[PDB]
C-alpha cells in the first residue's frame, strides 16, 4: 500500500541496485529466482504464482552493465522489460544522455515506469540511484526527473547520487556534468542523499580493515544505508519514517536539499567482538567526521538538520539520552534557526549480513542523514573546477555538438553561484 519505485540509472546506479536488490532479497527471504520458500509489498509485487518482481527499473544507455544483470545470478528476479538498455552510452557527456541519446529512450523508460506505477495502489515515490559525474547518470537522470515532475508532480522523488569526490576522480569532465545536472534537477528533486567514493574508501580502510576495497564493498555499504531508509518504510517499528518525512524534515528550503549519509556500525567481524556497540556509541560514531560518507568536514559548517534512523535492539530512552549528549557537545554545532533539529525513527528489524560481505553481524544500527552547511564547501570546490575549465572552454565542443549551447553552461554556473549564496545566507546567524 506504500509502494516505492526504484530507478537505477547508469553504471553506478545499476551496480548499486544490484547490491540493493540482493540485500532486499536476503532481508525478505526471497530467493534470487524470485520465489520465497506483506512487508515486501512496498518493493516487490507478487506474481500470483508466488513469484516476486521488484518494483525497479534498471535503465542505462549501454548494454554491458545491464547485460551482466540479465545473465547474472539474479537473471530470474527482474522483469525482462524492467531492464532497459540503449545501444551507445552517453560517453561521459551530459548532452548525449540528456539531448541526443537520452531522448531516444526516455519514452520507453517512462512507459515502463507508468506500467509499474499502475500496479501501485498507493505510490510513495521514486528512489533514483545514479552518479553525478556520468553521461547517463547526470544527463539522462535530469531528463527523467524533468519528465517525472510532470507525470507525477506531487509524488516525492529522492535521489541516491555519488557526489564527485574532492580528489579521487575517474573522469576529466566530472565538474561539467555535475554542474549541469545540479542546475537541471535543483527544482525537480525533493531530497538528494550524497555519498563520495573517496569517503567510503577511507571508511573501508579504517573501519573494515580492507586495504584494497572495490566497488562491490562500496555498493554493499550504500545498500545498507538504502536498506535502513526503506526498512523504516518496510518493517514495523516504534517510530516510523516515510519518504515525505524525509522531505519535510531534511529540507529547510526548496534548494537546500542535499543531505549527507552516514552509517555508524561499520565494523569487521573480528573487531566487532571486542566492542559493545550500544546506542550511545553508534550515535557518537555517526557524528564523528571520520565516519562521514561524504568527504567533507561537518566541523567546518553547521548542521541544518539531522535524521537518525535506528534499527534493531534500540530503546527510545537510550536514543533520547544519546541525542541529548550530542546536543550538549559543542564540537557539533547547529544553526540558530533550528532549535529542534533531530528527526528520529526506530525500527525493530536489525540489519541483515550479506553472505560474503565485510560488515559484521550486529544487533543495533543507525543511519544518519544530515543536512549541513559544510556541503557548501564541496559545491564551491566543484564550482571552482568548472571555472578552471570553462575559462579555456575545454571539452565544450563535445557538449555543444550534442544539442547543448554555451548559454546552458553559463546559466548552470549562475544557478550554482546562486546556490552557493543561498547556502551562505542559510549558514549566517539570525541574531
Amino acid at each position: 500500500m506504500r509502494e516505492c519505485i526504484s530507478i537505477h540509472v547508469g553504471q553506478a546506479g545499476v551496480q548499486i541496485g544490484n547490491a540493493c536488490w540482493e540485500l532486499y532479497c536476503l532481508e525478505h527471504g526471497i530467493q534470487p529466482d524470485g520465489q520465497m520458500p506483506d512487508s515486501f509489498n512496498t518493493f516487490f509485487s507478487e506474481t500470483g504464482a508466488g513469484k516476486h518482481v521488484p518494483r525497479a527499473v534498471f535503465v542505462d544507455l549501454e548494454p554491458t552493465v545491464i547485460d551482466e544483470v540479465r545473465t547474472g545470478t539474479y537473471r530470474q528476479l527482474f522483469h525482462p522489460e524492467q531492464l532497459i538498455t540503449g545501444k551507445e552510452d552517453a560517453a561521459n557527456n551530459y548532452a548525449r544522455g540528456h539531448y541526443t541519446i537520452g531522448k531516444e529512450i526516455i519514452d520507453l523508460v517512462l512507459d515502463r515506469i507508468r506500467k509499474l506505477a499502475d500496479q501501485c495502489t498507493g505510490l510513495q515515490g521514486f528512489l533514483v540511484f545514479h552518479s553525478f559525474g556520468g553521461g547517463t547518470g547526470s544527463g539522462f537522470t535530469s531528463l527523467l526527473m524533468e519528465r517525472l515532475s510532470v507525470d507525477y508532480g506531487k509524488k516525492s522523488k529522492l535521489e541516491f547520487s555519488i557526489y564527485p569526490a574532492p580528489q579521487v576522480s575517474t573522469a576529466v569532465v566530472e565538474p561539467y556534468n555535475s554542474i549541469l545536472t545540479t542546475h537541471t534537477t535543483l527544482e525537480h528533486s525533493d531530497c538528494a542523499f550524497m555519498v563520495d567514493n573517496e569517503a567510503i574508501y577511507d571508511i573501508c580502510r579504517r573501519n573494515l580493515d580492507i586495504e584494497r576495497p572495490t566497488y562491490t564493498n562500496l555498493n554493499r555499504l550504500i545498500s545498507q544505508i538504502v536498506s535502513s531508509i526503506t526498512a523504516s518504510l518496510r518493517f514495523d517499528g516504534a517510530l516510523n519514517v516515510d519518504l515525505t518525512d524525509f522531505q519535510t524534515n531534511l529540507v529547510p528550503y526548496p534548494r537546500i536539499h542535499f543531505p549527507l549519509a552516514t552509517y555508524a556500525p561499520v565494523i569487521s567481524a573480528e573487531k566487532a567482538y571486542h566492542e559493545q556497540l550500544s546506542v550511545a556509541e553508534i550515535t557518537n560514531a555517526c557524528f564523528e567526521p571520520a565516519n562521514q560518507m561524504v568527504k567533507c568536514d561537518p566541523r567546518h559548517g553547521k548542521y541544518m538538520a539531522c535524521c537518525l534512523l535506528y534499527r534493531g535492539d534500540v530503546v527510545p530512552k537510550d536514543v533520547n539520552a544519546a541525542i541529548a549528549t550530542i546536543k550538549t557537545k559543542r564540537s557539533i554545532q547547529f544553526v540558530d534557526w533550528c532549535p529542534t533539529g533531530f528527526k528520529v525513527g526506530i525500527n525493530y528489524q536489525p540489519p541483515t549480513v550479506v553472505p560474503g560481505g565485510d560488515l559484521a553481524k550486529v544487533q543495533r544500527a543507525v543511519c544518519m542523514l544530515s543536512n549541513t552547511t559544510a556541503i557548501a564547501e564541496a559545491w564551491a570546490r566543484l564550482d571552482h573546477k568548472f571555472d578552471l575549465m570553462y575559462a579555456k572552454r575545454a571539452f565544450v565542443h563535445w557538449y555543444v555538438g550534442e544539442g547543448m549551447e554555451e548559454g546552458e553552461f553559463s546559466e548552470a554556473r549562475e544557478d550554482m553561484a546562486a546556490l552557493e549564496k543561498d547556502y551562505e545566507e542559510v549558514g549566517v546567524d539570525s541574531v
Binding site: 553504471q11 551496480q15 549501454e62 548494454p63 554491458t64 552493465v65 547485460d67 551482466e68 545501444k87 551507445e88 552510452d89 560517453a91 561521459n92 557527456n93 553521461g135 580528489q167 579521487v168 576522480s169 575517474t170 573522469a171 576529466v172 569532465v173 566530472e174 565538474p175 567514493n197 573517496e198 574508501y201 573501508c204 580502510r205 584494497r212 576495497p213 572495490t214 566497488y215 562500496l218 573546477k385 578552471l388 575549465m389 575559462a391 579555456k392 572552454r393 575545454a394 571539452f395 565542443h397 563535445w398
Partner: protein, 430 residues
C-alpha cells in the same frame, strides 16, 4: 552491437593489422580457421564488435585490407590466420605508390578508393549500431599514408559522427626508413588533424628501445613491435568487448582526452612489459603497472613527456583489481608530478577498468597520453620538411603527380599551427 570497422593500408598497416587480428582472435578464442574454440562465455558475448558471424558459426573479421601492391596481401593470406579474413575484403592495386604521397592520394589511390569505399559501405551496412572505424597505417610511407588519408577523409564525409581512430606509425627521430618521410608525414598530418578523433602516434625507435631495454629482446623483429601495437589496440578497445567495474568505449576516451578538436594526438603504452628472465622478480600489482605506465621510457612514441605537460591521460586497466588502489595510485601520480599536468584541468586522469586480462596475464593496463610534448615530434617533422622544401628536393615527384606547391605550404602552415596550439596550451595558466 558497437561494431568497429578495421582498415589496413600499406605494408605497415597490413602487418600490424595481421598481428592485431591474431591477438584479438586469441582474446576471443577464435581459431585461425574462424571457428570459436574458446572456453569462457564472455568471449562470444561481444564478438560482434570486431567479428561478423557467418553460416556454420564461423567468425569473419570485419576488416578491410588495402594496399597498392599485391605482395603484402599475398604474405598475409599465406600465413597463420590468413584464411580468417573474407576473400572479398582484399582490395589491392598492381603498381604501388612508390613511397609517394601524391601517387597514393591522387592517382594510384584515387582509382582504388571507390572500390575500397564500396567494400566499406557493404561492411558498414551489416552493423546494428556502428561505433566507429580503425585505421592502421604509416605516415612516412606511400600507399599507407596517402591512401589511408584519402579513405579517412571520404569515410568522415560519409559518416561524420562515427568515431575514427588511427594507429599511425609516424617517422622516427634518429634514423629514417624513407628519404621522403617528411613530405608524406606532413601531408598526412595536415589531414589527420582535421578528419580524425584519435591518432595514436607510434615510433619504431621507441618500440626498439622498449624491446631492447625493457623486454631484453636480443633480436626484436617487426613481429614483436607489431605485437606491442596490437596489445595497445586491444587494451584501448577492451571495455567495448568485456564487462568491467568502469566501462569506457572509444567515444568516452575521445571525450575525456580531447579538450579541443585539433589536440587528438596520443602517445600509448603498455604496463606489464617485462623481460622473460625478470617475470619472477616483480610483483604484478596496480602500483607497478602505474609506475611502468607513467615512465617516459615506456611510451611508444619517441617523445619525452617530461618536456611538456599532460593535457590528459587515460588508463584502461584489465583484470580483477581494486578501484580503491587504482584511484589512490592515480591521485598519487597526479600529486607527485604536479608540474607535468596542466593546472587548468583538475583530475587530468580518466580511469576505466575491465575484468578480463589479456591471455597469460593476471593484470594489464593500456595508457594513453595527450601531452604537449607531442609537439616536439611535429616540430621535428616540420623542420625536416622545410629543409627539403626550401630546395624543392624530391618535389617534382609530387608536383608531377598532380599536386601544387601551395598544397605543401598549406600543410606546413597547418602543422605549424598545430605546434603553436600545443605550445599555447602548454603555457596556459589558470
Amino acid at each position: 552491437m558497437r561494431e568497429i570497422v578495421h582498415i589496413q593500408a600499406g605494408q605497415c598497416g597490413n602487418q600490424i593489422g595481421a598481428k592485431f587480428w591474431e591477438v584479438i582472435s586469441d582474446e576471443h578464442g577464435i581459431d585461425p580457421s574462424g571457428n570459436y574454440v574458446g572456453d569462457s562465455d564472455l568471449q562470444l558475448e561481444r564478438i560482434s564488435v570486431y567479428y561478423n558471424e557467418a553460416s556454420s558459426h564461423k567468425y569473419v573479421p570485419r576488416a578491410i585490407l588495402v594496399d597498392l601492391e599485391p605482395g603484402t596481401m599475398d604474405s598475409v593470406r599465406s600465413g597463420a590466420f590468413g584464411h580468417l579474413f573474407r576473400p572479398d575484403n582484399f582490395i589491392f592495386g598492381q603498381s604501388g605508390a612508390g613511397n609517394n604521397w601524391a601517387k597514393g592520394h591522387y592517382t594510384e589511390g584515387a582509382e582504388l578508393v571507390d572500390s575500397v569505399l564500396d567494400v566499406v559501405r557493404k561492411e558498414c551496412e551489416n552493423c546494428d549500431c556502428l561505433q566507429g572505424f580503425q585505421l592502421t597505417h604509416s605516415l612516412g610511407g606511400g600507399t599507407g599514408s596517402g591512401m589511408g588519408t584519402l579513405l579517412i577523409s571520404k569515410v568522415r564525409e560519409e559518416y561524420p559522427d562515427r568515431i575514427m581512430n588511427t594507429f599511425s606509425v609516424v617517422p622516427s627521430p634518429k634514423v629514417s626508413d624513407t628519404v621522403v618521410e617528411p613530405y608524406n608525414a606532413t601531408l598526412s598530418i595536415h589531414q589527420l588533424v582535421e578528419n580524425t578523433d584519435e591518432t595514436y602516434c607510434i615510433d619504431n625507435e621507441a618500440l626498439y628501445d622498449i624491446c631492447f631495454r625493457t623486454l631484453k629482446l636480443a633480436t626484436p623483429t617487426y613481429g614483436d613491435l607489431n605485437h606491442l601495437v596490437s596489445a595497445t589496440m586491444s587494451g584501448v578497445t577492451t571495455s567495448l568487448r568485456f564487462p568491467g567495474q568502469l566501462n569506457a568505449d572509444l567515444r568516452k576516451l575521445a571525450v575525456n582526452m580531447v579538450p579541443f578538436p585539433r589536440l587528438h594526438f596520443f602517445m600509448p603504452g603498455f604496463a606489464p612489459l617485462t623481460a622473460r628472465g625478470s617475470q619472477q622478480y616483480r610483483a604484478l600489482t596496480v602500483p607497478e603497472l602505474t609506475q611502468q605506465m607513467f615512465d617516459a621510457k615506456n611510451m611508444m612514441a619517441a617523445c619525452d613527456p617530461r618536456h611538456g605537460r599532460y593535457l590528459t591521460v587515460a588508463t584502461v586497466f584489465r583484470g580483477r583489481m581494486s578501484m580503491k588502489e587504482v584511484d589512490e595510485q592515480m591521485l598519487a601520480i597526479q600529486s607527485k608530478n604536479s608540474s607535468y599536468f596542466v593546472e587548468w584541468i583538475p583530475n587530468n586522469v580518466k580511469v576505466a577498468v575491465c575484468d578480463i586480462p589479456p591471455r597469460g596475464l593476471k593484470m594489464s593496463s593500456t595508457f594513453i597520453g595527450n601531452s604537449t610534448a607531442i609537439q616536439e615530434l611535429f616540430k621535428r617533422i616540420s623542420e625536416q620538411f622545410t629543409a627539403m622544401f626550401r630546395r624543392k628536393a624530391f618535389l617534382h615527384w609530387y608536383t608531377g603527380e598532380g599536386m601544387d606547391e601551395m598544397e605543401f605550404t598549406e600543410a606546413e602552415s597547418n602543422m605549424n599551427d598545430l605546434v603553436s596550439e600545443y605550445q599555447q596550451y602548454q603555457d596556459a595558466t589558470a
